[PDB]
Amino acid sequence: DVEFDALLGSYCNTLSLVRFLELGLSVACVCTKFPELAYMNEGRVQFEV
C-alpha cells in the first residue's frame, strides 16, 4: 500500500503601494510639510484684497 496527502500550492497577496501623487486629486492640495506642527498654536495666512 502507498498513500499520501498533498498541498498543491499556497497563495498570497500584493498590497497596492499607492503614492499620494499618483492620484488625480493631488491638484487640490498644497502639500508642504512641517518637521514640527505639535509645538505650534493657531497659525495664520494673510489676505489683502
Cβ proximity of 3 and 9 under 8 Å: no
Q: What is the DSSP letter of 15?
A: -
Taking CB under 8 A as the rule, does residue 8 contact a copy of itself?
yes
Q: Which of residues 12-41 bind a copy of itself (CB under 8 A)?
A: 12-13, 39-41
Task: Tell me how far, at minimum, the Cβ of 19 lies from a copy of itself, in Å.
Answer: 23
**Nearest CB to a copy of itself, comparing residues 24 and 40:** 40
Cα separations in angstroms, 32 against 5, 13, 23, 29: 58, 33, 17, 9
Q: What is the contact surface with a copy of itself in residues (CB under 8 A)?
A: 2-13, 39-49
